[PDB]
Nucleic acid binder design. Sequence first.
DNA 1: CGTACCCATTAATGGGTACG
DNA 2: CGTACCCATTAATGGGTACG
Lengths: 66, 66
Amino acid sequence: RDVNQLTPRERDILKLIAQGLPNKMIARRLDITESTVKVHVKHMLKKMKLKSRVEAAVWVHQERIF
Amino acid sequence: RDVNQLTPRERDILKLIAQGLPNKMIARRLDITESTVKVHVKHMLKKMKLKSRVEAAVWVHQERIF
DNA sequence: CGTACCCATTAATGGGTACG
DNA sequence: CGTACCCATTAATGGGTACG
């Protein structure tokens, strides 16, 4: 699990997920469509080998990433 | 937002959600049906004024509830 | 309280193509 | 890379009734 392997946008989304935001809120916060957020989300999830956004959030708080 | 306001089983579910498990896994870990797991999740979210299981997970880690 | 359904609806997952 | 859509599916939400 290496956070540096993600792209800037992917880290943007991961940070917001770790703050408990649903895809629609992330889209409004970053001012991009929900479609795009979802693309970043699945890319991040595949690269980090995480089963869901909840794992992503928990993982972020455990390894104190960001 | 007091964790003590929850029932024992509700805290069991919260703990497992904060460990990033989906309802189906929680059901197997607790040896109860997914149906019952969903009822506890639903009760817990309303009582704790959380909007999703992700907020529940982040909250637990931020306030170190457990 | 905990159990386990019923209902409907929305959110999220995970594969694809496309194009500056 | 980042954008934004296409597809289909599962996971999750949030009301309800029921019963030991």
